[PDB]
């Protein structure tokens, strides 16, 4: 979670990120997971590369990414971590699948390379 501009990257920031952030199921992903306050002892044992929308947000603002694929990977790491750590049927998983569907949807309208 450290921070430090193509047509695709602009789209990811102005359209994709914005769309997920304003969604009601995004609050659990707006900040890095705090294993102590959430009492999740095993979280960082299981998750080696944590990720959240605020980190992505900040990386986009500070021109951290060199290409869109990097940013898209971060969005996917966020979802993957959720699915890996939590159990199917859990509320947060349902929320992540909803956010990912909206993500794939918006991504499909992103301008094509070259």
């Amino acid at each position: 979670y450290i921070n430090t501009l193509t047509n695709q990257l602009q789209f990811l920031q102005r359209v994709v990120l914005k769309a997920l952030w304003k969604h009601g199921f995004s609050w659990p992903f707006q900040q890095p997971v705090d294993a102590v306050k959430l009492k999740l002892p095993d979280y960082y044992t299981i998750i080696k590369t944590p990720m959240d929308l605020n980190t992505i947000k900040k990386r986009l603002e500070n021109k951290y990414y060199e290409k869109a694929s990097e940013c898209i990977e971060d969005f996917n790491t966020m979802f993957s971590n959720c699915y890996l750590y939590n159990k199917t049927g859990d509320d947060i998983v349902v929320m992540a699948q909803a956010l990912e569907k909206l993500f794939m949807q918006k991504l499909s309208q992103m301008p094509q390379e070259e």
């Binding site: 659990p28 159990k87 859990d90 947060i92």
Partner: peptide
Amino acid sequence: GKGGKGLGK
């Protein structure tokens, strides 16, 4: 697990 998140309100 993280518990419920209010789904099904």
